[PDB]
């Protein structure tokens, strides 16, 4: 398909898409709509207390597209890759 | 006349000068002419922003004539009444004209409009004597009423309202500006809202920080006392991004900031403003007043 | 043919650029005078080169189909050019004085 | 013929290009940060300008001429139609603009006599 | 009326109208509105400032094809200003488009700038500003003339612009004459098109008329006259005529004259003066 | 050495072708 | 690996372009607009996310460098200035260009355009404004990039990269 174009860093693209597919899978992800993590961890840069809420009409799909879009790293953090695995939706993190 | 020097001054207006540092507002009690009940009605409410060209032949005396004219226009469009009031004490300088309120009461106020200008003198420095410069409009109520009032004002005073927009740079600057403000009663944790750019609606990250942690981090990244500088804002954003990436390995920096809320006030890109604390209220207006000028010029 | 000569020209410019780069390996008014001088000398060089080459071409043509079609086309089209030119000249002559009178009256 | 000589000269300049490439490659390439980039780029630019200025200071058969001439006559005959069509289009455009100019001139004329007579009437009245 | 308040009232009106129309576009109604604005601009014999500010704001963001017809007619009506503030803000992006856009777009901007020059001379009727503008447009001219493999399509616009320039002293009583660069001189004088020869003869005739009407300029003019008198009395561009002369007489210049080279009579009778008689 | 095709070979080719770390975050929190 | 313009030899009437940025889809669409039409010279397109460029012994000459910057995100900026440290100064002599996307939507422009203007003026490099989302604007930028490639590649006799730099130079 248009061999004149010579994509570079194609290894990065093929690694990130493979990792995303292995983490998520071809099956349609469950339709989850709300998430919230309550975190309290040391700064390392008196622990900082963080509180995040993810709102989306279709979660697990925008998260699925973050890595292909390049927004996040190829391996996503376990706090986002275990939502169907750990069967957990609200989290708390300490240092 | 005024047109020539106005041409020259907007010719000099190029994106080459450095962004000047801004003085952090201090705890300032409401002014004596400021009625606590009127602002209390104004505060703790949602407002939509509008930029306005200077009024042509506007008089503060014939307010009843304006009220009856708006009532006539409304009934022509169709148990409601229009009330005009004059509000003292919220002008940045003596140059800034007097502010006033317009209310729609169903004989229960349903639609409120505020015309004001705080510390806005560049427009006042390039205007003739006939005009009145209150380029800031705050609307609260039904959109149909706002459109009707805008149509009346366009027909009457030969002006438009333009929906003022706030970008990520300005919103981050103002976020740093109010997190620099000292609040005795931390009654609302700071909160930021983001939106990933995607044609289908996608994840919208909301990031909240405890007020004590936010103040400590600010004072850590606070260098010039009583002043905010672009380097301070940039390091604030960089620290937040580094914290987020350390948490989740996600580059929040590639996302559009859409809403910033803190203990004193909250702002949204579309033009939504919520005000809670009066102690910095006036200064708030001044900052956003510059944006109206920046939209006029 | 044409591809050969255009490749030859491109290789010539590439070689000249490489020579300039290897020679350069060893304020603003000085630089400004630099592009002025190089523009002048390059303009003079192209003037001389084009003049000599297509003067040789003109001589070759003097030494000597669709040629009749080309010549009748150029004759008719150039006559149309001059007619349009005269029309524009007279129209602009009218425009000048009418606009000047309009400005004075304004 | 001439094509063989041109090909030989092309190969010769290819050899010269390879010689220049292997001559220039024996230099540490570069490294710049934000602070000192401007002066370095200015110096590099002025050096290149002087080099190319010095370089420029240092600086067939009838059949190919005939073929190129035929090509250029064909190109001229096949592109003059655009400039002609522009010539007509501007001719009628100028005619229309001139007519509009006379219209405006005529209107402002009676405007002028009306203004002058009104001014004279007001002057006489007072 | 020349009333100060109505000036500001119309300025803010039209400026905000232009902003809202532009933001709503991203089209036919916008094009029609801008056409009406241009029609009004043809009247009043002076440019507006709301359009100037809008074009300043939108030129850097301008792609060059959104409303090119509309944009290029506003630059024609630009208020007179020194050639030291407009170039950093206006002519830089103009050159940015010019050096990279289509050749027809080049002819377009050439027409726009020559109209601007006409408007500025009309308004004035200081000289350093127009001199710098002429030098800048000439630099653009020679650069593009090199750029397009010496295409005569742009050369026609170059020469037409220079004819419009060549009448400053006799049209606006301004004692200022600027000479076109020698690159264009040599490219056009010995070009292969006959109408090019025609309009060069015309332009040097007009230059001589302007010169005799009122130091280095005279020397360069004399050098050019020697150059063309050496090039003229042959010319390859006339071989066509010669072929016709073979199809149909020691004196063949009369046949050329009947073919329609009246500018050539004007140049060879009233300018060279070496052989005044035909 | 992928045989750097001679210019002559490459030239004719073009002419002819004108017809076609998953353990470090579970250890910190 | 610092990239050098004068490493290898180019192909017979061959030109190459490099696009470095974050949005892969935008780069792919821009390359599609690049190759919608092909001139006499063959064209090669390379897309990358960051610098230094991945090592490849089979790399041809890269005659043009184009950095795409989105004013919608500071991340693209940080990417650009981090990648800028892996190229020699010789590329900066007219072989580098900056293309800003989304500048028209002043509301959506996260970072102020004054910043990127200052960045470009600091390095004396051409600066172009376009909107990749719009098909017409993208196409216009397509012939723009094709023709600036033709100019810088030396295909047209008369000018070089430093010449076009002196052409496209900003006053301040």
Resolution in A: 8.9
Chain B contact residues (CB < 8 Å to A): 189, 196, 198, 200-210, 213, 216-217, 239, 242-243, 246-251, 254-255
Where does residue G43 rank: exposed (0-12), middle (13-18), buried (19+ CB within 10 A)? buried
**CB of B167 closer than 8 Å to CB of G107:** yes
Query: Cα distance from G131 to chain E (closest Cα, Å)?
Result: 8
Asked whether residue G147 is domain-assigned, the answer is yes
Residues from chain E contacting residue B128 (CB–CB below 8 Å): 4-5, 8
Strand partners, B195: B256
Instruction: Give residue for tokens 């709509």.
Output: A33
Helical (H) or strand (E) element with D120: helix D62-125
Which tokens in the block code for residue G96? 């580098």
Q: Do chains E and F touch (3 or more CB pairs under 8 A)?
A: no
- Please name the member of C55, C62, C103 whose beta carbon is closest to the beta carbon of E45: C103
Query: Do G26 and F21 contact (CB within 8 A), yes or no?
Result: no
Which chain E residues are within 8 Å of G104, Cβ to Cβ? 26, 61
Name residues 52-81 of chain G within 8 A of B (Cβ). Answer: 72-76, 78
Residue G106 has which token pair?
Answer: 């002043």
Q: Considering the domain boundaries, does residue G4 fall inside one?
A: no
Query: If we measure between CA atoms, which residue out of G60, G55, G53 comes closest to residue G20?
Result: G53
Across chain B, where does the E strand assignment appear?
22-23, 46-52, 55-56, 80-87, 99-106, 109-116, 131-132, 136-140, 161-162, 190-195, 204-209, 227-228, 256-261, 265-268, 272-275
Whether G6 maps to a domain, the answer reads no
8-state DSSP, G159: -
**Do residues D80 and C77 lie in contact, with contact meaning Cβ atoms separated by under 8 Å?**
yes
State how far the Cα of B174 lies from the Cα of B184, in Å rounded to an integer. 19
What is the spatial distance between Cα C21 and Cα C38, in angstroms, rounded to a whole number? 16
Which pair of tokens denotes residue D55? 């370089």
E32 vs E10: CA distance, rounded Å? 19
D110-113 long-range contacts (CB < 8 A, ≥24 apart) are D112/C105
Terminal-to-terminal C-alpha distance of chain B: 18
List the structure tokens of B127.
Answer: 């205007």
User: Is the CB of F12 inside 8 Å of chain G's CB atoms?
Assistant: no
Say if residues G43 and A64 touch (Cβ distance below 8 Å): no
End-to-end CA distance of chain A: 49
Neighbours of A82 (CB within 10 A): 14
- Cβ-Cβ contacts under 8 Å for C23 (sequence gap 6 or more): D51, D54, D55
**3-state DSSP call for residue E47?**
coil
SS (H, E, C) D32-97: CCCCCHHHHHHHHHHHHHHHHHHHHHHCCCHHHHHHHHHHHHHHHHHHHHHHHHHHHHHHHHHHHH
| Other Cβ atoms closer than 10 A to B256 | 17
C47 touching chain E per CB within 8 A: yes
Helix (H, G, I), strand (E, B) or coil at E196: helix
**In whole angstroms, what is the distance from residue D101 CA to residue C98 CA?**
8
DSSP code at position G5: T
Distance from CA of E8 to the nearest CA of B (A): 7
Give the CA-trace dihedral at G51, G55, G59, G64, to 10 degrees.
Answer: 10
Report CA-CA distances (Å) from G26 to G31, G64, G117, G135.
9, 19, 22, 12
User: Is E71 in contact with E34 (CB distance < 8 Å)?
Assistant: no
**Beta-carbon pairs below 8 A across chains C and G:** 27
Specify the DSSP element, H or E, that contains B38. helix B36-42
3-state secondary structure of E174: coil
DSSP 8-state class, residue E181: P
Select from B58, B83, B64, B67 the least CA-distant residue to B134. Answer: B58
User: Which residue in E134, E100, E92 sits closest to E117, CA to CA?
Assistant: E134
- What is the Cα–Cα distance from C7 to F15, expressed in whole angstroms? 13
- As separate numbers, helices (DSSP H) first and strands (DSSP E) second, chain F gives 1, 0
DSSP output for E118-163 = HHHHHHH--HHHHHHHHHHHHHHHHHHHHHTTS-HHHHHHHHHHHH
Report in angstroms the alpha-carbon separations of C105 from D108, D109, E47: 9, 9, 18
Integer distance in angstroms from the first to the last C-alpha of chain C?
64
d(CA C84, CA D93): 12
Contact G151, E78 (CB under 8 A): no
Classify the C-alpha dihedral B43-B44-B48-B49 as positive or negative: positive
- Residue in E closest to G133 by C-alpha: E26
Separation of alpha carbons G44 and E9, rounded Å: 55
Contact G80/G111 with Cβ under 8 angstroms? no
What would the 3-class secondary structure string for B186-233 be? CCCCEEEEEECCCCCCCCEEEEEECHHHHHHHHHHCCCCCCEECHHHH
G12 three-state secondary structure: coil
- Share of chain E residues as helix, strand and coil, in percent rounded to the nearest 5: 70, 0, 30
Q: Which DSSP category does B138 fall into? A: E
C-beta separation of B49 from B138 below 8 A: yes
Kindly tell me the sign of the dihedral angle through the C-alpha atoms of E229, E235, E240, E243.
positive
Token pair of G119 as six digits = 């960045």
Contact G168 E95 (CB under 8 A): yes
Residue G93 lies in a domain: yes
Token output for E92: 């830089």
**Cβ count within 10 A of residue F21:** 7
How far, in Å, CA of E269 to CA of E253, rounded? 13
Closest CB from D13, D20, D98 relative to C91: D98
Q: Distance (Å, rounded) from C-alpha E84 to C-alpha G4?
A: 38
Domain of G155, in residue numbers: 14-168
What burial letters (b/e) apply to B71-92, b meaning 16+ CB within 10 Å? eebbeeeeeeebebeebeebbb
Among G105, E107, B275, B250, smallest CA distance to D85 is for E107
Contact (Cβ atoms closer than 8 angstroms) between residue E259 and residue E242: no
- Give the number of other Cβ atoms within 10 Å of residue F14's Cβ: 14
Backbone φ and ψ for B21, nearest 5 degrees, come out as -70, 155
G105 CA to chain B: closest CA distance, Å?
A: 10
In angstroms, what is the C-alpha Rg of chain D?
A: 34
What is the rounded CA–CA span in Å between residue B212 and residue B206? 18
CA-nearest of E18, E55, E64 to G137 is: E64
Q: Distance between CA B181 and CA B184 in Å, rounded?
A: 10
After which residues is chain B discontinuous, taking C to N > 2.5 Å? 78, 107
Name B83's bridge partners.
B103
Within 8 A by CB and 6+ apart from B135, the residues are: B51, B52, B53, B54, B117, B120, B123, B289, B292, B293, B296
CA G25 – CA G7 distance, rounded (Å) = 30
Q: Are B289 and B120 in contact (CB under 8 A)?
A: yes
Query: Quick check: G104 and E61 CB within 8 A?
Result: yes
Distance in angstroms (rounded) separating the CA atoms of residues G155 and G13: 8
- Cα(C95)–Cα(D12) distance, rounded to whole angstroms? 61
Spatial distance between the Cα atoms of E183 and C83, rounded to a whole number of angstroms: 28
C70-87: b (≥16 Cβ within 10 Å) or e: bbebbbebbebbbebbeb
The residues facing G42 across adjacent strands are: G14
- Experiment used for this model: cryo-EM
Q: Are E255 and E244 in contact (CB under 8 A)?
A: yes
D64-87 per-residue burial string, b: 16 or more CB within 10 A, e: under 16: bbeebbeeebeebbeebeebeebb
Q: Look-up: residue for tokens 């709102």?
A: A55
G8 located within any domain: no
Residue at G7 is within a domain: no
Give the tokens for residue E3.
């009333």
Q: Is B274 helix (H, G, I), strand (E, B) or coil?
A: strand
What CATH number does the domain containing G88 carry?
3.40.50.300
Overall number of domains in chain G:
1
Whether D65 and C35 lie within 8 Å, measured CB to CB: no
Nearest to E197 by CA among E232, E165, E240: E232
DSSP letter for G56, please. Answer: -
In a domain, G5, yes or no: no
To the nearest whole angstrom, how far is the Cα of G86 from the nearest Cα of chain A? 16
Please choose, from the candidates G18, G5, G41, G45, the residue with its C-alpha nearest in 3D space to the C-alpha of residue G155: G41
CA B294 vs CA B51, B290, B297, E120, G66: distances in Å: 10, 6, 5, 31, 32
| E/G touch flag: 3 or more CB pairs below 8 Å | yes
Assess whether the previous peptide bond of G52 is cis (omega < 30° from 0): yes
For CA atoms E242, E248, E251, E254, give the dihedral sign. negative
Q: How far is CA G101 from CA B198, E116, G16, in A?
A: 16, 32, 22
Element (H, E) at G119: helix G113-123
Indicate whether G1 belongs to any domain: no
DSSP state letters, A8-69: SSHHHHHHHHHHHHHHH-SSPPP---EEEEEEEE------EEEEEEEE-SSTTTHHHHHHHH
- Which value, to the nearest 10 degrees, does the dihedral of the CA atoms of residues G83, G84, G90, G92 take? 120
Query: For residue E275, how many other CB atoms are within 10 A of its CB?
Result: 9
Give residues with Cβ within 8 angstroms of G13, minimum separation 6: C3, C6, C7, C10, F14, G40, G41, G42, G155
Q: Do B209 and B197 meet the contact criterion of CB atoms below 8 Å apart?
A: no
The answer to whether the beta carbons of residues E158 and E110 sit under 8 Å apart is yes
CA G104 from chain centre, in angstroms, equals 19
Nearest to E165, CA basis, from E108, E115, E98: E115
Among the partner-chain residues G9, G89, G162, the one whose CB lies closest to the CB of D30 is G89
Contact G51, G87 (CB under 8 A): yes
Q: What whole-number distance in Å separates Cα of residue E76 and Cα of residue D119?
A: 36
Task: With beta carbons under 8 A apart, name residues in chain G contacting F7.
Answer: 12
């Amino acid at each position: 398909m248009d061999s004149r174009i010579i994509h570079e860093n194609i290894v990065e693209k093929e690694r990130v898409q493979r990792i995303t597919q292995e983490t998520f899978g071809d099956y349609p992800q469950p339709q989850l709509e709300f998430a919230q993590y309550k975190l309290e961890t040391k700064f390392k840069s008196e622990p900082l207390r963080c509180l995040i809420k993810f709102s989306s009409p279709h979660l697990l799909e925008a998260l699925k597209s973050l890595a292909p879009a390049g927004i996040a790293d190829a391996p996503l953090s376990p706090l986002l890759t275990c939502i169907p695995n750990k069967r957990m939706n609200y989290f708390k993190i300490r240092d | 006349p005024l047109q020539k020097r106005l041409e020259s001054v907007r010719k000099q207006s190029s994106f080459i000068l450095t962004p000047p540092r801004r003085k952090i507002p201090q705890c300032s009690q409401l002014q004596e002419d400021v009625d606590p009940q009127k602002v209390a009605f104004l505060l703790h409410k949602q407002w939509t922003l509008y930029s306005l060209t200077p009024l042509y032949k506007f008089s503060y005396s014939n307010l009843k004539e304006y009220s009856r004219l708006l009532n006539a226009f409304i009934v022509a469009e169709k148990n409601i009444k229009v009330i005009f009031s004059t509000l003292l004490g919220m002008k940045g300088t003596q140059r800034d004209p007097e502010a006033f309120l317009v209310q729609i009461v169903s004989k229960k106020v349903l639609w409120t409009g505020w015309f004001c200008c705080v510390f806005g003198d560049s427009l006042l420095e390039t205007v003739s004597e006939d005009f009145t410069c209150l380029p800031l409009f705050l609307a609260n109520g039904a959109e149909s009423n706002t459109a009707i009032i805008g149509t009346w004002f366009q027909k009457t005073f030969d002006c438009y309202f333009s929906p003022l927009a706030i970008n990520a740079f300005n919103l981050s600057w103002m976020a740093a500006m109010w997190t620099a403000c000292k609040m005795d009663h931390y009654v609302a944790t700071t909160e930021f809202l983001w939106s990933v750019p995607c044609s289908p609606q996608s994840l919208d990250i909301s990031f909240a920080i405890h007020p004590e942690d936010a103040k400590a981090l600010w004072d850590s990244v606070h260098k010039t006392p009583g002043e905010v500088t672009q380097e301070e804002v940039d390091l604030f954003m960089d620290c937040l991004y580094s914290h987020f990436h350390r948490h989740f390995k996600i580059h929040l920096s590639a996302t559009r900031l859409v809403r910033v809320s803190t203990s004193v006030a909250s702002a949204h890109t579309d033009g939504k403003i919520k005000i809670l604390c009066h102690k910095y209220l006036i200064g708030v207006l001044a900052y956003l007043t510059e944006l109206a000028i920046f939209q006029i010029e | 043919d044409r591809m050969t000569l255009l490749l030859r020209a491109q290789t010539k410019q590439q070689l000249l650029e490489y020579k300039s780069m290897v020679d350069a390996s060893e304020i603003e008014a000085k630089i400004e005078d630099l592009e002025n001088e190089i523009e002048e000398v390059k303009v003079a060089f192209e003037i001389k080169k084009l003049a000599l080459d297509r003067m040789r071409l003109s001589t070759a043509l003097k030494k000597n189909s669709v040629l009749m079609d080309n010549m009748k086309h150029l004759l008719e089209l150039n006559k149309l050019i001059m007619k349009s030119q005269q029309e524009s000249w007279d129209l602009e002559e009218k425009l000048l004085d009418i606009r000047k009178k309009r400005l004075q009256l304004k | 013929n001439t094509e063989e000589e041109l090909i030989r000269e092309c190969e010769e300049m290819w050899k010269d290009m390879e010689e220049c490439q292997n001559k220039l490659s024996l230099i540490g390439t570069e490294t710049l940060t934000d602070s000192n980039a401007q002066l370095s780029l200015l110096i590099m630019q002025v050096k290149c300008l002087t080099a190319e200025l010095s370089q420029w200071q240092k600086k067939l058969t009838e059949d190919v001429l005939i073929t190129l001439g035929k090509e250029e006559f064909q190109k001229l005959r096949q592109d003059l139609e655009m400039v002609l069509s522009t010539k007509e289009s501007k001719n009628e455009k100028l005619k229309e603009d001139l007519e509009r100019e006379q219209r405006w001139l005529d209107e402002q004329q009676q405007i002028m006599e009306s203004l002058n007579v009104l001014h004279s009437e007001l002057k006489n009245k007072v | 009326v020349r009333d100060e308040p109505v000036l500001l009232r119309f300025y803010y009106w039209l400026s905000q109208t232009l902003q809202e129309e532009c933001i709503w576009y991203k089209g036919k109604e916008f094009t029609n509105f801008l056409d009406t604005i241009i029609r009004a601009e043809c009247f009043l014999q002076e440019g507006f400032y709301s359009c100037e500010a809008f074009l300043y704001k939108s030129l850097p963001l301008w792609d060059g094809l959104c409303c090119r017809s509309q944009f290029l007619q506003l630059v024609s009506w630009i208020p007179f200003s020194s050639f030291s503030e407009v170039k950093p803000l206006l002519f830089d992006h103009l050159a940015q488009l010019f050096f990279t856009s289509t050749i027809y777009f080049k002819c377009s901007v050439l027409q726009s700038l020559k109209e601007l020059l006409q408007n500025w001379l009309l308004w004035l009727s200081s000289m350093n500003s127009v001199s710098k503008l002429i030098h800048y447009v000439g630099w653009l001219s020679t650069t593009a003339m090199r750029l397009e493999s010496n295409n005569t399509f742009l050369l026609h616009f170059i020469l037409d612009f220079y004819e419009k320039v060549c009448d400053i002293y006799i049209n606006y009583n301004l004692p200022l004459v600027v000479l076109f660069p020698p690159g264009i001189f040599y490219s056009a004088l010995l070009s292969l098109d006959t109408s090019i020869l025609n309009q060069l003869c015309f332009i040097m005739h007009r230059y001589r008329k302007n010169l005799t009407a009122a130091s280095k300029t005279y020397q360069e003019f004399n050098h050019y006259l020697t150059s063309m008198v050496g090039c003229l009395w042959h010319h390859p561009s006339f071989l066509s005529y010669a072929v016709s002369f073979l199809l149909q007489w020691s004196w063949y210049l009369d046949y050329l004259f009947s073919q329609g080279l009246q500018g050539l009579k004007l140049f060879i009778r009233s300018s060279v003066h070496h052989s005044s008689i035909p | 050495r992928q045989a750097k095709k001679s210019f002559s070979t490459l030239f004719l080719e073009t002419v002819k072708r004108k017809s076609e770390d998953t353990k470090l975050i579970e250890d910190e929190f | 690996s610092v990239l050098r313009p004068l490493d290898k030899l180019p192909g017979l009437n061959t030109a190459t372009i490099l696009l470095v940025g974050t949005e892969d889809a935008l780069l792919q669409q821009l390359a599609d607009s690049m190759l919608k039409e092909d001139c006499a010279s063959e064209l090669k397109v390379h897309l990358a996310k960051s610098l230094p460029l991945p090592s490849s012994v089979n790399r041809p000459r890269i005659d043009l460098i184009v950095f795409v910057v989105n004013l919608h995100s500071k991340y693209s900026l940080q990417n650009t200035e981090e990648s800028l440290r892996h190229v020699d100064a010789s590329f900066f002599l007219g072989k580098v260009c900056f293309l800003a996307t989304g500048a028209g939507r002043e509301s959506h422009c996260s970072i102020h355009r004054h910043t990127v203007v200052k960045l470009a003026h600091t390095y004396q490099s051409p600066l172009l404004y376009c909107d990749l989302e719009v098909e017409g604007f993208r196409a216009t930028m397509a012939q723009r990039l094709v023709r600036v490639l033709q100019i810088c590649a030396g295909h047209v006799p008369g000018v070089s990269a430093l010449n076009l730099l002196s052409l496209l130079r900003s006053s301040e």
